[PDB]
Every structure is written in structure tokens, then in C-alpha cells.
Amino acid sequence: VDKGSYLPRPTPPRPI
Amino acid sequence: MKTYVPKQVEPRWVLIDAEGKTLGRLATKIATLLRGKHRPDWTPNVAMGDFVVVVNADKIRVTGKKLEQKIYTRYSGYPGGLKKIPLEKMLATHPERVLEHAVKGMLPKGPLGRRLFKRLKVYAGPDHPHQAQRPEKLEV
Amino acid sequence: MKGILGVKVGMTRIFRDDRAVPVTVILAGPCPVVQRRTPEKDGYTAVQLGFLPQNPKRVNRPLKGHFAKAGVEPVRILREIRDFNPEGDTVTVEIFKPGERVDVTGTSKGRGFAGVMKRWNFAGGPDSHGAHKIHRHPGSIGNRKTPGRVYKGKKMAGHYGAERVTVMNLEVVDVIPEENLLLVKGAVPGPNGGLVIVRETKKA
Amino acid sequence: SRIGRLPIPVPKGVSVEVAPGRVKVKGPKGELEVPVSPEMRVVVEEGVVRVERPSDERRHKSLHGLTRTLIANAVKGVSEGYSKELLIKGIGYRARLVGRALELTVGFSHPVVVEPPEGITFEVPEPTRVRVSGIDKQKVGQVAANIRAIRKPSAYHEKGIYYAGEPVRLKPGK
Amino acid sequence: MKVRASVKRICDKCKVIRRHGRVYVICENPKHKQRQG
RNA sequence: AAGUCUGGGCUAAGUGGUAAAGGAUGUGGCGCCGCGAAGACAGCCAGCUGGUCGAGUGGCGCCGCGCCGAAAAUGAUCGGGGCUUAAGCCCAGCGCCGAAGCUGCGGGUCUGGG
RNA sequence: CGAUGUCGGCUCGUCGCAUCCUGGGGCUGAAGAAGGUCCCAAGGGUUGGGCUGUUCGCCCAUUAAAGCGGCACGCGAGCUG
RNA sequence: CGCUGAAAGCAUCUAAGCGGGAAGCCCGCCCCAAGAUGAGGCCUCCCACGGCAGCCGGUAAGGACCCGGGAAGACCA
Ligand SMILES: [Mg+2]
Ligand SMILES: [Mg+2]
Ligand SMILES: [Mg+2]
Ligand SMILES: [Mg+2]
Ligand SMILES: [Mg+2]
Ligand SMILES: [Mg+2]
Ligand SMILES: [Mg+2]
Ligand SMILES: [Mg+2]
Ligand SMILES: [Mg+2]
Ligand SMILES: [Mg+2]
Ligand SMILES: [Mg+2]
Ligand SMILES: [Mg+2]
Ligand SMILES: [Mg+2]
Ligand SMILES: [Mg+2]
Ligand SMILES: [Mg+2]
Ligand SMILES: [Mg+2]
Ligand SMILES: [Mg+2]
Ligand SMILES: [Mg+2]
Ligand SMILES: [Mg+2]
Ligand SMILES: [Mg+2]
Ligand SMILES: [Mg+2]
Ligand SMILES: [Mg+2]
Ligand SMILES: [Mg+2]
Ligand SMILES: [Mg+2]
Ligand SMILES: [Mg+2]
Ligand SMILES: [Mg+2]
Ligand SMILES: [Mg+2]
Ligand SMILES: [Mg+2]
Ligand SMILES: [Mg+2]
Ligand SMILES: [Mg+2]
Ligand SMILES: [Mg+2]
Ligand SMILES: [Mg+2]
Ligand SMILES: [Mg+2]
Ligand SMILES: [Mg+2]
Ligand SMILES: [Mg+2]
Ligand SMILES: [Mg+2]
Ligand SMILES: [Mg+2]
Ligand SMILES: [Mg+2]
Ligand SMILES: [Mg+2]
Ligand SMILES: [Mg+2]
Ligand SMILES: [Mg+2]
Ligand SMILES: [Mg+2]
Ligand SMILES: [Mg+2]
Ligand SMILES: [Mg+2]
Ligand SMILES: [Mg+2]
Ligand SMILES: [Mg+2]
Ligand SMILES: [Mg+2]
Ligand SMILES: [Mg+2]
Ligand SMILES: [Mg+2]
Ligand SMILES: [Mg+2]
Ligand SMILES: [Mg+2]
Ligand SMILES: [Mg+2]
Ligand SMILES: [Mg+2]
Ligand SMILES: [Mg+2]
Ligand SMILES: [Mg+2]
Ligand SMILES: [Mg+2]
Ligand SMILES: [Mg+2]
Ligand SMILES: [Mg+2]
Ligand SMILES: [Mg+2]
Ligand SMILES: [Mg+2]
Ligand SMILES: [Mg+2]
Ligand SMILES: [Mg+2]
Ligand SMILES: [Mg+2]
Ligand SMILES: [Mg+2]
Ligand SMILES: [Mg+2]
Ligand SMILES: [Mg+2]
Ligand SMILES: [Mg+2]
Ligand SMILES: [Mg+2]
Ligand SMILES: [Mg+2]
Ligand SMILES: [Mg+2]
Ligand SMILES: [Mg+2]
Ligand SMILES: [Mg+2]
Ligand SMILES: [Mg+2]
Ligand SMILES: [Mg+2]
Ligand SMILES: [Mg+2]
Ligand SMILES: [Mg+2]
Ligand SMILES: [Mg+2]
Ligand SMILES: [Mg+2]
Ligand SMILES: [Mg+2]
Ligand SMILES: [Mg+2]
Ligand SMILES: [Mg+2]
Ligand SMILES: [Mg+2]
Ligand SMILES: [Mg+2]
Ligand SMILES: [Mg+2]
Ligand SMILES: [Mg+2]
Ligand SMILES: [Mg+2]
Ligand SMILES: [Mg+2]
Ligand SMILES: [Mg+2]
Ligand SMILES: [Mg+2]
Ligand SMILES: [Mg+2]
Ligand SMILES: [Mg+2]
Ligand SMILES: [Mg+2]
Ligand SMILES: [Mg+2]
Ligand SMILES: [Mg+2]
Ligand SMILES: [Mg+2]
Ligand SMILES: [Mg+2]
Ligand SMILES: [Mg+2]
Ligand SMILES: [Mg+2]
Ligand SMILES: [Mg+2]
Ligand SMILES: [Mg+2]
Ligand SMILES: [Mg+2]
Ligand SMILES: [Mg+2]
Ligand SMILES: [Mg+2]
Ligand SMILES: [Mg+2]
Ligand SMILES: [Mg+2]
Ligand SMILES: [Mg+2]
Ligand SMILES: [Mg+2]
Ligand SMILES: [Mg+2]
Ligand SMILES: [Mg+2]
Ligand SMILES: [Mg+2]
Ligand SMILES: [Mg+2]
Ligand SMILES: [Mg+2]
Ligand SMILES: [Mg+2]
Ligand SMILES: [Mg+2]
Ligand SMILES: [Mg+2]
Ligand SMILES: [Mg+2]
Ligand SMILES: [Mg+2]
Ligand SMILES: [Mg+2]
Ligand SMILES: [Mg+2]
Ligand SMILES: [Mg+2]
Ligand SMILES: [Mg+2]
Ligand SMILES: [Mg+2]
Ligand SMILES: [Mg+2]
Ligand SMILES: [Mg+2]
Ligand SMILES: [Mg+2]
Ligand SMILES: [Mg+2]
Ligand SMILES: [Mg+2]
Ligand SMILES: [Mg+2]
Ligand SMILES: [Mg+2]
Ligand SMILES: [Mg+2]
Ligand SMILES: [Mg+2]
Ligand SMILES: [Mg+2]
Ligand SMILES: [Mg+2]
Ligand SMILES: [Mg+2]
Ligand SMILES: [Mg+2]
Ligand SMILES: [Mg+2]
Ligand SMILES: [Mg+2]
Ligand SMILES: [Mg+2]
Ligand SMILES: [Mg+2]
Ligand SMILES: [Mg+2]
Ligand SMILES: [Zn+2]
């Protein structure tokens, strides 16, 4: 069932 | 002065007729003999107890309704792998395991307890193969 | 219980009452008894059968001894049949008459490292609609923190075939004793030239 | 107000030997042994057997009556013998003997063959009455019960295998 | 059979008997047969 | 590690070792009437009385301990083994074991008095 | 909160039983057949479609039946988005 | 669901005892399996080696290496 959404949609970073 | 610690002794072999005796009350004694705590020079970090031979272990006796109600249990590691076996059936199929399981649970866990367990020789029927060792008949 | 060793030679169909019937032909005879197992000696009842003649150049001394005590020429294969005690010193296809039902054991064909789809008939992944490098993949293998592990016996990729298989209750369609031949209805495990065992069925 | 302490008449000439935990009762129709609680003491008097209990607590009172009746039935067993009679009611329904065996023809697609166990005799007078007989009372009642179970009395119709003297209680039909 | 936590006599011909750790009520009337559970 | 310790009693469910309204000829213990050698209760022979049986019998209340009511998700279990005139529960005892508490012996340091 | 990725689907299951079906029963206002209701039972089984992101639900055509729940509303270092 | 049957003269599947009774339970079928360290069993083969429950060395029965391959196979087996 649709409830909240406690996190943004993710995306990977870039270390260096 | 420091406490006496014995040098290795010749262990004693022992014979017990399990017939008609109560499962747990017999097991209790078999364990003690195994640990050798009947010996005045008892040492907790070495095997110095007796070898215990038991006969007529199929004729062990038990109180209450435990023939039909006591459940021995085994988990195989697989899903739904818990097998259940009642006393009655265990006696019918592997009677010596009854007395063996009881005793094993009353031994210490760990490397020594496992060794002490191996010095236990249980048989169904009145005969045992160790007359070579000439075990001394015990009354318990 | 009765049984014989044999080799799988090949498949055909024959005609019987205006019906085509798929058969697998098996070269079974002849099998010399080379040892008997007895309750007083071994604790159970069976007959060790030899099969196929071997160049005695390749049979070592411990094996030579075994054969000699049975008064039997060197054979390539030894295998037992439990609860079988032929009155004879030699076992042939004649122990099976047409209409009998049999159990045939062989060594299945080996697929080596088999994907979860070939091995376990998994559905695999979709082939379009965004499916990402998972077209032949098995999916989830578990749950989460509880139980936080994977069950024993989880169907997974791995070796497949080249293992002992028994197909049961096959009709004996014919037997051609003069060629040590057995015709069995249907399919038998393993490749042509494969060692197989034929036993009287255990179904009723 | 008591069963165990009521004395058991023993006919001529049936004997009653007594052992621990059992009594043997022989007579003109056969012999059979009666297992008895070791807590109870049976007693061999003149032409009569008595049972006495060691106290007046519950288990002992219960064992008392049972033991007396148990032996009384054994006594009557080897002398008079035991029987039960079965009524076969229903049109197509009938019974007959085939050797020692009993053949029930009672509405199935097949007839049913009941084999008499050891110590049991079958009789078919009319083809609608069956007699189960033997020296063992519990065995007779059991087999009789067995025969009846083949086709218990219908609830709506006077049809099936009946006990002699069992009433025909019925429910209305539509 | 009725299976209830409260098994009672329904008619004067009902009988509260107890077999195998369980309380039953048996009777001439089949409807009155009860087992506690 | 130290009692298979002693004496009286209850429990038969492994209760002990997970729960309620409520239900029950479970078992033990008290209590109160009813009914009966002028023959009660039960069963066999009649119409709540009659006849042969020859003892007890039927209802009510409290108390102890148990029974049911009691279905949930990975493999079970009172911590385990195992325990039934107990290794359970109630009452009364004697003994032991058991901590870095207390004691004995030695030492350190501070404080107070010499 | 110096991160425990959040619905639904797909894949793969596994467990519970308050049981949808199949097996065994008692009662029935159970004639038969077919139902009702409660008891035992978790071994196996529990279909394909239209609509909507849907879970759910409705509908079509069937079925022995088209069970209800737990597993981080099972499963995104397995996929989808 | 019964048989027999007291406590409780009747009755009661139960308190002694005995039956019947599920796709379910245990065997039975198929497959793995003695690291089952509780390491099982049978048949066969070699054998009494030289040096000072150990050591160095040469062999026996046998094993491996290497090669030609293989409906066996990732390598390995
Ligand atoms: Mg929310
Ligand atoms: Mg005892
Ligand atoms: Mg003892
Ligand atoms: Mg001792
Ligand atoms: Mg005893
Ligand atoms: Mg028991
Ligand atoms: Mg698992
Ligand atoms: Mg399983
Ligand atoms: Mg399961
Ligand atoms: Mg389970
Ligand atoms: Mg298992
Ligand atoms: Mg299984
Ligand atoms: Mg410890
Ligand atoms: Mg045999
Ligand atoms: Mg083979
Ligand atoms: Mg594949
Ligand atoms: Mg593949
Ligand atoms: Mg491929
Ligand atoms: Mg493929
Ligand atoms: Mg496949
Ligand atoms: Mg496919
Ligand atoms: Mg597919
Ligand atoms: Mg698909
Ligand atoms: Mg595909
Ligand atoms: Mg993408
Ligand atoms: Mg792609
Ligand atoms: Mg899973
Ligand atoms: Mg875990
Ligand atoms: Mg595996
Ligand atoms: Mg392989
Ligand atoms: Mg067929
Ligand atoms: Mg007909
Ligand atoms: Mg019926
Ligand atoms: Mg009407
Ligand atoms: Mg009900
Ligand atoms: Mg009510
Ligand atoms: Mg009333
Ligand atoms: Mg029962
Ligand atoms: Mg009644
Ligand atoms: Mg004591
Ligand atoms: Mg004692
Ligand atoms: Mg005492
Ligand atoms: Mg209980
Ligand atoms: Mg318990
Ligand atoms: Mg409990
Ligand atoms: Mg409670
Ligand atoms: Mg209460
Ligand atoms: Mg109450
Ligand atoms: Mg009382
Ligand atoms: Mg008076
Ligand atoms: Mg009267
Ligand atoms: Mg309970
Ligand atoms: Mg449950
Ligand atoms: Mg349940
Ligand atoms: Mg639980
Ligand atoms: Mg639970
Ligand atoms: Mg559970
Ligand atoms: Mg569970
Ligand atoms: Mg005491
Ligand atoms: Mg101190
Ligand atoms: Mg000091
Ligand atoms: Mg100081
Ligand atoms: Mg200070
Ligand atoms: Mg000073
Ligand atoms: Mg946070
Ligand atoms: Mg960090
Ligand atoms: Mg962190
Ligand atoms: Mg992080
Ligand atoms: Mg995480
Ligand atoms: Mg879909
Ligand atoms: Mg997918
Ligand atoms: Mg799909
Ligand atoms: Mg699961
Ligand atoms: Mg599920
Ligand atoms: Mg489970
Ligand atoms: Mg319900
Ligand atoms: Mg439905
Ligand atoms: Mg059904
Ligand atoms: Mg059903
Ligand atoms: Mg039904
Ligand atoms: Mg109707
Ligand atoms: Mg009707
Ligand atoms: Mg019907
Ligand atoms: Mg029904
Ligand atoms: Mg319902
Ligand atoms: Mg249920
Ligand atoms: Mg199921
Ligand atoms: Mg399920
Ligand atoms: Mg659909
Ligand atoms: Mg759709
Ligand atoms: Mg939808
Ligand atoms: Mg879901
Ligand atoms: Mg809904
Ligand atoms: Mg909706
Ligand atoms: Mg709508
Ligand atoms: Mg249909
Ligand atoms: Mg239907
Ligand atoms: Mg649907
Ligand atoms: Mg529904
Ligand atoms: Mg579901
Ligand atoms: Mg869930
Ligand atoms: Mg979560
Ligand atoms: Mg949730
Ligand atoms: Mg989820
Ligand atoms: Mg929640
Ligand atoms: Mg779901
Ligand atoms: Mg789900
Ligand atoms: Mg997740
Ligand atoms: Mg994940
Ligand atoms: Mg992702
Ligand atoms: Mg997702
Ligand atoms: Mg993760
Ligand atoms: Mg009756
Ligand atoms: Mg009777
Ligand atoms: Mg009677
Ligand atoms: Mg009587
Ligand atoms: Mg009984
Ligand atoms: Mg009892
Ligand atoms: Mg039975
Ligand atoms: Mg019957
Ligand atoms: Mg079937
Ligand atoms: Mg092997
Ligand atoms: Mg094998
Ligand atoms: Mg080995
Ligand atoms: Mg092996
Ligand atoms: Mg090995
Ligand atoms: Mg082991
Ligand atoms: Mg062996
Ligand atoms: Mg070996
Ligand atoms: Mg062996
Ligand atoms: Mg051999
Ligand atoms: Mg020599
Ligand atoms: Mg030599
Ligand atoms: Mg020398
Ligand atoms: Mg060497
Ligand atoms: Mg060589
Ligand atoms: Mg090569
Ligand atoms: Mg190659
Ligand atoms: Mg290959
Ligand atoms: Mg290589
Ligand atoms: Zn009633």
C-alpha cells in the first residue's frame, strides 16, 4: 500500500 | 605444598545391568562414573573416570506417560527438517540411543566431555562384547 | 528380486498390433556370478555380477585373485543385484519374458555446469521491457534480516546430469536370447554404449 | 450397592485355578484365562469364587467390581457359552453360510464375506438371522458389532443389519 | 457434535461423562451430544 | 560447588514449565439438610403408592491441588539433560555449598592518637 | 538521520493454520443427489484473461478449488521503475 | 465410532484391558550418504628388506607423472 517515501530516489557518486 | 595431581592410572571398566532402572536416575550415576568424581584424586582437566558398560538398555524403565509423550527431536538444516520421534518408537528402533542421549546431556560440553562419552558402551540385550576387559559388575 | 547388467545400444520403434512402439535396445547377457553375498558372511543377500570380457593384460593381481576364486574369466565390470540368488552360475536375458515390467538404471547424460533454467526449469528473466542482464538469472535467493540466510537445498546453478538415474516400470517388449538382446519400451537413462542395470520392477 | 463383593456361583464341573495377575477358568465348552490386578485377591471357596479388595480407596473399589464380573463372565463362558443374534431387515438383504464363513448380501455392488476368528462360530437359521457364538464374551460382542457395522440400521428406513432386540427408531422422510 | 467451552446438560436424559481427559455430554438425543473444546 | 537429607500431606496434568469469563460425577478434605430395617436409592414384576432385594442414598455450600476453555508464522526445548511416595507443590526441620560481604596472615597509603 | 532505499510488478521461494480444494468425521429443519454447520487434517494443489501504477476490487471464461496471513507490508549489492 | 467394563446393583469407548479409524505420521519408492572421527563390512593382492610405535634408503602389491582421447568436464575430478 502507498505510504510515505522516506528517502529520495538515489544516484551514485564519484570518489576520487 | 601444592595440590596432588595424579599420573595416568589404569582406568577401571565397569558393568551395569540397566534392566528395570529409571532412565534419568541411572544416567545420573553413569555420568558421575564417567567423570570419575567417585575417585578421591579427581582432576577436572583429564579423562580419569571409568569405562562404563551397560546391558539390557532396552529394558530401561520410565515413569508417567513418557513412552508416548517424550519426544526426541532432530533438525537437519533443511527447511521443515525437524523430525520428531517418541520414546516408544526410539526403543523399538534404536533402544540404546535412549540411554545414550540421556547420559550425553549430563556430560560437560566440549572436547573432554565428548571423550568421556566415548568411554560409554551401551547395549540392548544381556550380552556385551568386552569380556576381554573383564569389567567389574556395579550395583547402582 | 532379479536383475542383469547391460549396455544401452540404441533406440527404435517396432510394430506390434498396428501400433508403433518406441523401444530402447539393451545388450544384457551374459553375466557370470562372481560372488554371492550371504547373511552369515556379509549380512545381506545379493549377487555380484561380472560383465564384458577384459584383456587379462589390464587386470591386476588383486583383481585376478577375485576372479580366480570364482573360476571366471576376467571381466570389465562388477556390479551387484540385492536380494537376487540365481540357481545358476550364469545370468542371461532369459530371466525376462515379454510383458514383464522392469526398472532400468543408468548414468544420465551430463550437462556440466547447468544454468538455473536448464537445471531447475526456472522462468528466468524477461527479454525486453527494461530487463537488465538478468534474462537467465534466478531472481531472489532469500528474504531479509529474518532469517538472514539461504536455505540448504536452495535450487541453484551447478552440475547436472552424469548421475545415477532409475526410470521405473518399463515394458519388456521382446527378448532375443541368441543375441543377448532386450527390447524395452520407452526411454533409458544415459548415452549409447552406457552401462545400465535391468531389474524386475517394484511397481504392481 | 456392590458388585465385587457379591460371590460368584461356580457350576459343576468348571474349575478355577488361581495365579498372580491371572485366573484360568476351564469347563465343558473350553478354557480361557482372565488377567486380574495383582492388587486384588481372588478366592476359591466351595462351589463359589469370591473377590476381595485390599482397601476402600478409589482405584481399589473400581478394580473390585471389574474383576468380579470379569471372572463371572469367564465362568458362564465355559459352561453356558455366549451368543448374540442379528436381525437382517431390508428387501434384497439376506445372509448365508459358505463353509464356516458368513456371506452378507446387503445392497452393495458385491456381497461381503466375514471370516470367523478363532473361538467363534457362525449360524444362519432363516436367511435373515445370524448367530454369533463362542465362549469369550468380549470377543462375541466385538464380532457381532463387526457384522453390524457392515450395514448399520438406516435412519429413515427399516433396513440393514440389526441387533436382536434393538429398537427401530426412525426419522420422517420428506 | 457441538464443540463448546461450556458444555451443559440440555435435557434430563443428557449425561455428563468424562473420557480421555475430555468432558463429554452424551445423550439419547443426538443433537445434545457435546464435547468440550 | 553442596542432601538422590529427615518427617506429615497433595498433585497424575510432565500440572509443575505462560492467560480470562465460564464449563465439568477429576481428586482429596470439611459442612449442611433430604431419605431409609415402619425397608430408601438402583435394577427385575404393578399402578407418585404397591411387591424381593438388604443397605446406605440424593441434592446444596466452602477448602487444597489439578481438567477444559488455549490458533501464527526459520527448529525444537522447563537454561539443558532428565524428573512422578518427585528432581513438582504445601507444612516442619537438620546439615552443607555459595561473593571481591565478614574472619585469619602479610603488605601499601592517607588520617587520627601515642 | 558520519543513510535501515521507500508502493506495485517480476523472479525465487519458505513457513503458519483461523482450511479454498482434495482425505476423514459428528450434528442436520441429512429421503436420494446436492447443501448447511462444527470437529480432525498443512501432504499436495490453489488457472487464463479485460480495466487501473496499483496492492485491493469489479468483470469475462473456466475450475476439485480459484484460501487468508507471516517472512524489514519476504525478496532493488536479483530485475523492473 | 465401538467391544468388554467397574467406581456408582443401572448406565458409561476407560478408570484394568481390546477393536475400528485420514490425501495426514512412520516404513515402503527414487537419489545422496562411513569426515557415521561411532571413520562399518566382505572378496582379493603384497609381505616376514638393509642401516643406527623413530630415522634414512631400496623395493613388493599397487599408485602417480607424461601421452592419445572421451555424450566426463570451467580448472580439477
Ligand atoms: Mg506514510
Ligand atoms: Mg524411580
Ligand atoms: Mg538406578
Ligand atoms: Mg556411584
Ligand atoms: Mg518403574
Ligand atoms: Mg509412559
Ligand atoms: Mg531452512
Ligand atoms: Mg521436509
Ligand atoms: Mg510445512
Ligand atoms: Mg513445522
Ligand atoms: Mg526432515
Ligand atoms: Mg519430506
Ligand atoms: Mg559451562
Ligand atoms: Mg531376499
Ligand atoms: Mg552403475
Ligand atoms: Mg540455463
Ligand atoms: Mg545451462
Ligand atoms: Mg547456456
Ligand atoms: Mg539451456
Ligand atoms: Mg531439468
Ligand atoms: Mg522448459
Ligand atoms: Mg517460464
Ligand atoms: Mg515468466
Ligand atoms: Mg523466457
Ligand atoms: Mg536501466
Ligand atoms: Mg539485455
Ligand atoms: Mg526464499
Ligand atoms: Mg538467523
Ligand atoms: Mg544440497
Ligand atoms: Mg559429475
Ligand atoms: Mg499403466
Ligand atoms: Mg444392486
Ligand atoms: Mg451416516
Ligand atoms: Mg415429513
Ligand atoms: Mg458445533
Ligand atoms: Mg449453553
Ligand atoms: Mg435438566
Ligand atoms: Mg482414543
Ligand atoms: Mg445415554
Ligand atoms: Mg529423599
Ligand atoms: Mg526418595
Ligand atoms: Mg524425606
Ligand atoms: Mg492435559
Ligand atoms: Mg512440563
Ligand atoms: Mg503446560
Ligand atoms: Mg493454567
Ligand atoms: Mg478459572
Ligand atoms: Mg470456575
Ligand atoms: Mg468430595
Ligand atoms: Mg430411621
Ligand atoms: Mg425400588
Ligand atoms: Mg493443555
Ligand atoms: Mg498450533
Ligand atoms: Mg493446531
Ligand atoms: Mg510460536
Ligand atoms: Mg506460539
Ligand atoms: Mg507452531
Ligand atoms: Mg512452529
Ligand atoms: Mg516427602
Ligand atoms: Mg573488604
Ligand atoms: Mg591487616
Ligand atoms: Mg591500613
Ligand atoms: Mg583518609
Ligand atoms: Mg605524632
Ligand atoms: Mg534515518
Ligand atoms: Mg560512514
Ligand atoms: Mg555507518
Ligand atoms: Mg553510508
Ligand atoms: Mg542496509
Ligand atoms: Mg503479472
Ligand atoms: Mg524478473
Ligand atoms: Mg510472468
Ligand atoms: Mg519462510
Ligand atoms: Mg506466501
Ligand atoms: Mg515450523
Ligand atoms: Mg472459524
Ligand atoms: Mg473463495
Ligand atoms: Mg471430505
Ligand atoms: Mg474436507
Ligand atoms: Mg466434510
Ligand atoms: Mg433436505
Ligand atoms: Mg431433501
Ligand atoms: Mg448426500
Ligand atoms: Mg458434513
Ligand atoms: Mg464458516
Ligand atoms: Mg484445525
Ligand atoms: Mg494442506
Ligand atoms: Mg502454504
Ligand atoms: Mg490474472
Ligand atoms: Mg492486467
Ligand atoms: Mg489489478
Ligand atoms: Mg506482495
Ligand atoms: Mg479485501
Ligand atoms: Mg481500487
Ligand atoms: Mg465498483
Ligand atoms: Mg466444478
Ligand atoms: Mg463440489
Ligand atoms: Mg483470478
Ligand atoms: Mg476470497
Ligand atoms: Mg497467499
Ligand atoms: Mg507480510
Ligand atoms: Mg523495510
Ligand atoms: Mg507493516
Ligand atoms: Mg516490500
Ligand atoms: Mg506492523
Ligand atoms: Mg502479498
Ligand atoms: Mg507476500
Ligand atoms: Mg529490501
Ligand atoms: Mg536486498
Ligand atoms: Mg535498483
Ligand atoms: Mg522495488
Ligand atoms: Mg543489502
Ligand atoms: Mg452404545
Ligand atoms: Mg456393554
Ligand atoms: Mg453391565
Ligand atoms: Mg453390571
Ligand atoms: Mg485404558
Ligand atoms: Mg488414570
Ligand atoms: Mg486402537
Ligand atoms: Mg467396528
Ligand atoms: Mg493420492
Ligand atoms: Mg559410496
Ligand atoms: Mg550408492
Ligand atoms: Mg571408512
Ligand atoms: Mg559407501
Ligand atoms: Mg574417507
Ligand atoms: Mg555424532
Ligand atoms: Mg557393519
Ligand atoms: Mg572402510
Ligand atoms: Mg555389514
Ligand atoms: Mg568383491
Ligand atoms: Mg624373508
Ligand atoms: Mg620381501
Ligand atoms: Mg639393526
Ligand atoms: Mg622409504
Ligand atoms: Mg609399476
Ligand atoms: Mg589425460
Ligand atoms: Mg580433455
Ligand atoms: Mg560431457
Ligand atoms: Mg590433469
Ligand atoms: Zn439430552
C141 neighbourhood in chain B, CB within 8 Å: none
Q: Which nucleotide is nearest to B106 (CA to C1')?
A: F81
Q: Residue D141 and residue D163: Cα distance in Å, rounded?
A: 11
Cα angle for residues D118, D119, D120 (degrees, 5° grid): 95
CA C78, C80, C85, C86 torsion-angle sign: negative
Q: Where are the beta strands (DSSP E) in chain B?
A: 13-17, 51-55, 71-75, 82-86, 120-122, 136-137
CA dihedral C103, C108, C114, C118 (to 10 degrees): -50
User: Which region, left, alpha or beta, applies to residue B58 given φ > 0 means left and ψ of -120 to 50 means alpha?
Assistant: alpha
Cα separation, D99 vs D118, whole angstroms: 15
Task: Give the bases of strand F that a protein CB approaches within 7 Å.
Answer: 1, 4, 12-14, 20-28, 40-41, 55-57, 67-70, 74-76, 80-85, 87
Neighbours of E28 (CB within 10 A): 11
CA distance C141 to D130: 68
Residue of C nearest to B77 (CA): C152
- Is the CB of residue D46 less than 8 Å from the CB of residue D60? no
The three three-digit cell numbers of residue B80, written as one number: 521443515
Which residues have CB under 8 Å from D16's CB, separation 6+?
D10, D23, D24, D25, D42, D44, D49, D71, D75
C-alpha cell at D110: 458385491
For residue D63 the three cell numbers come to: 478394580
Straight-line distance from the first to the last Cα atom of chain D, in angstroms, rounded to the nearest whole number:
48
| The one-letter amino acid at C49 | L
- Chain C hits for B78, CB-CB cut-off 8 Å, are 151-153
- Radius of gyration over alpha carbons of chain B, in Å? 17
Neighbours of chain B (3+ CB pairs under 8 A): C
Q: D28 CA, F42 C1': separation in Å?
A: 35
**A10 is written with which cell numbers?**
538515489
B97, B87, B92: which is closest to B117 by C-alpha?
B97
Burial (Cβ within 10 Å: 0-12, 13-18, ≥19) of residue D24: middle
Distance CA E22, CA E37 (A): 8
Cβ of C203 less than 7 A from strand G: no
User: CA D46 – C1' G65 distance (Å)?
Assistant: 73
Give the other-Cβ count within 10 Å of B16's Cβ.
Answer: 23
Residues 1-16 of A with CB under 7 A from strand G: 1-10
Q: Is E32 annotated as a binding residue?
A: yes
Residue D56: CA count within 13 A, CB half-sphere: 2
DSSP B62: -
Bridge partners (DSSP) listed for residue B85: B72
E3 touches strand G (CB under 7 A): yes
Residue D23 burial (CB count, 10 A): 23
Nearest nucleotide by C1' position to the D5 CA atom: H9
The Cα–Cα gap between B73 and B86 comes to 9
E11 labeled binding residue: yes
Write the DSSP string, D52-103.
Answer: E-S-SSHHHHHHHHHHHHHHHHHHHHHHT-EEEEEEEESSS-EEEEETTEEE
Residues of B in contact with C154 (CB under 8 A): none
* Cα gap B91→B94, rounded to integer Å: 6
Q: Other C-beta atoms within 10 Å of B5: how many?
A: 9
Q: Which of C150, C151, C154, C155 to mutate to test the interface with B (most CBs of B within 10 A)?
A: C151
Q: What is the resolution of this structure in A?
A: 2.7
C-alpha count within 13 angstroms, C-beta hemisphere, residue C100: 21
Q: How far apart are the first and last CA of chain B?
A: 37
Sign of CA dihedral C171, C177, C178, C181: positive
Determination approach:
X-ray
Q: Distance of alpha carbon D167 from its chain centroid, rounded?
A: 20
Q: How far apart are CA C142 and CA C145, in angstroms?
A: 10
- For C151, phi then psi, to 5°, come to -60, 145
Q: How far apart are CA E35 and CA D9, in angstroms?
A: 41
Q: Using CA atoms, how far apart are residues C98 and C113, in angstroms rounded to an integer?
A: 40
Distance of C1' in F22 from CA in E8, Å? 11
How far is C-alpha C84 from the geometric centre of its chain's CA atoms?
18
Asked if E15 CB < 7 A from strand F, the reply is no
Q: Report CA(B21)–ligand 116 centroid distance (Å).
A: 40
CA–C1' nearest nucleotide, residue E36: F68
- Phi then psi dihedrals of residue D138, to 5 deg: -70, -30
Return the H-helix or E-strand segment holding D25: strand D22-27
Given a contact cutoff of 8 angstroms between Cβ atoms, the answer to whether B58 and B50 are in contact is no
Give me the CA D122–C1' F100 separation in Å, rounded: 89
Ligand 115 center to D71 CA (angstroms): 13
C-alpha cell at E2: 457441538
- State the distance from the centre of ligand 50 to the C-alpha of C154, rounded, in angstroms: 85
Which among C32, C162, C4, C7 has a CA at the least distance from the CA of C88? C32
Instruction: Give the angle subtended at the CA of E32 by the CAs of E29 and E34, to the nearest 5°.
Output: 135
Q: For B123 and F96, how far is CA from C1' in angstroms?
A: 38
Provide residues of B within 8 Å CB-CB of chain C.
Answer: 76-79, 81
Cell output for D61: 473399589
Sign of the torsion formed by the C-alpha atoms of C19, C20, C23 and C29? positive
Nucleotide nearest to C70 (CA to C1'): H43
B31/chain C closest Cα distance in angstroms? 34
Question: In whole angstroms, what is the distance from residue E11 CA to residue C202 CA?
Answer: 59
Burial annotation C40-49 (CB, 10 A radius, 16+ → b, else e): eeeeeebbbb
Please return the burial class of D143, using the count of CB atoms within 10 Å of its CB with bins 0-12, 13-18 and 19+: buried
Interatomic CA distance for residues C83 and C9, integer angstroms:
27
E14 is in an annotated binding site: yes
From the list E26, E4, E23, E7, the residue with the least C-alpha distance to E15 is E26
Please list every residue in chain C whose beta carbon sits closer than 8 Å to the beta carbon of residue B82.
none
Q: Measure CA B105 to chain center.
A: 9
